[PDB]
Amino acid sequence: SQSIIAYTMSLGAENSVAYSNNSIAIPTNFTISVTTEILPVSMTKTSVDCTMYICGDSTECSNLLLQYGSFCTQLNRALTGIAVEQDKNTQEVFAQ
């Protein structure tokens, strides 16, 4: 019975409002409803030792990498900034 169907998407149920130069609508009853809203506040912290990752536990690899300048310390600084910003986000949102 069930099968794959493709169709022009419905933008919604059409509703022609009863507009007139003297026709007004006023609500007689209400519904105090509640809706949920979801927002990420922080991601998992992560610190990746550049040398332990790319030249993990290898003195020769670390020595060869040291020729590559300050790349690894740049990445470490960036990730420490990410972690401190995660704490900053949580602190700012929940420390009002």
């Binding site: 009863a18 003297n22 609500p27 105090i32 509640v34 809706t35 991601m43 009002q96």
Partner: protein, 133 residues
């Protein structure tokens, strides 16, 4: 801040509709809000008049809009039907009939006049009562 620490007038920000209050609840790596919104449910058609003439002077609803159920004119809040008797302490005078478009005729009850009417009858009767002595 604008939903929890207070009420926000920003429509469609703290939930869908007129916002009332928001209850935060923690979550893993996130937050989840519970926006309490006021959503009108039952509506009805009505006859409206931009303004009201009383004695050539025009009248406008201080708070709410002029509404009529077909026979009698009333004023009610725009977001909830609570018709009120059109009274002077419910409206303010401005201009006259010749300017307002769509204005209609109906008398506006000054609350002071009927109150003093009882005093008028007491005043009139005492003058008749003062004839005997």
């Amino acid at each position: 801040s604008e939903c929890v620490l207070g009420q926000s007038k920003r429509v469609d920000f703290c939930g869908k509709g007129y916002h009332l209050m928001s209850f935060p609840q923690s979550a893993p790596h996130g937050v989840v809000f519970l926006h309490v919104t006021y959503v009108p449910a039952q509506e009805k058609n009505f006859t409206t008049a931009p303004a009201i003439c009383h004695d050539g002077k025009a009248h406008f609803p201080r708070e709410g809009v002029f509404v009529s159920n077909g026979t009698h004119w009333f004023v009610t809040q725009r977001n909830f039907y609570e018709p009120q008797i059109i009274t002077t302490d419910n409206t303010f005078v401005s201009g006259n009939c010749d300017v307002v478009i769509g204005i209609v005729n109906n008398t506006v009850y000054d609350p002071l006049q009927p109150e003093l009417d009882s005093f008028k009858e007491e005043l009139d009767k005492y003058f008749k009562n003062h004839t005997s002595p």
